[PDB]
Design a protein around this ligand. Structure first.
Ligand SMILES: COc1cc2c(cc1OCCCN1CCCC1)N=C(N)C21CCC1
Ligand SMILES: COc1cc2c(cc1OCCCN1CCCC1)N=C(N)C21CCC1
Ligand code: NA
Length: 190
């Protein structure tokens, strides 16, 4: 009877566009906004937030049949994360391991300077394969910044408490900010 770890499928439609079909795993029901679910969609690496009870773009929501059931040292670390591009050449992004992901146990939350939204990867596998180099509260408040983009602070990172997750009203990504840095300098809170 778990929410965390439920598998779901649904349709998605924007405006008069076509309906696309999606499958994913529910990770979290956000405590400061229980309408908001964080979801990992199969094949896509970002964590997404949807208010499933209110978002008219969601249709035909179904619960899928239920699945049949260390390196905490990496949490908080600066990392260089290597990956393959479409032409087969190697590239790398620098980022920060944020936490273990809640439901998909072997998975970690991570974000990157080049794309400071919330991602999820099986970083211990990536580490064993040589693709991860390891280097050396406002929750519940409203946020705005000037483009007025509005949102809510939904989580504080235990390992780096100046780092927060923000859900903006106009988008389904989860944004990550370290409030001492330039990238956060236009965020204001209420
Ligand atoms: C609408 O979602 C996506 C749209 C796109 C996508 C991935 C999407 O979703 C990933 C998984 C979360 N969504 C699934 C339902 C809501 C969030 N990669 C793309 N190139 C596009 C950009 C426009 C076509
Ligand atoms: C597509 O990127 C990655 C894919 C993968 C990855 C690391 C990747 O990238 C890290 C940094 C962010 N990327 C996000 C867009 C490009 C960079 N570790 C893996 N096991 C996989 C292989 C299939 C899942
Ligand atoms: Na207010």
């Amino acid at each position: 009877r778990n929410i965390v770890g439920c598998r779901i499928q649904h349709g998605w439609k924007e405006g008069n566009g076509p309906v696309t079909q999606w499958k994913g795993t529910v990770l979290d029901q956000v405590p400061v906004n229980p309408s908001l679910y964080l979801i990992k969609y199969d094949g896509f690496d970002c964590v997404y937030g949807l208010e499933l009870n209110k978002d008219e773009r969601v249709s035909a929501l179904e619960v899928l049949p239920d699945r049949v059931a260390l390196a905490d040292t990496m949490i908080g670390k600066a990392v260089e994360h290597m990956f393959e591009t479409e032409d087969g050449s190697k590239d790398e992004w620098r980022g920060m391991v944020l936490a273990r992901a809640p439901v998909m146990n072997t998975w970690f939350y991570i974000t990157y300077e080049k794309d400071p939204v919330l991602y999820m990867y099986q970083l211990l596998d990536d580490y064993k394969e040589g693709d991860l180099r390891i280097m050396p509260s406002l929750v519940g408040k409203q946020v705005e910044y000037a483009k007025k983009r509005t949102g809510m602070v939904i989580h504080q990172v235990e390992a780096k408490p100046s780092v927060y997750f923000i859900k903006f009203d106009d988008d389904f990504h989860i944004y990550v900010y370290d409030l001492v840095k330039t990238s956060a300098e236009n965020l204001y809170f209420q």
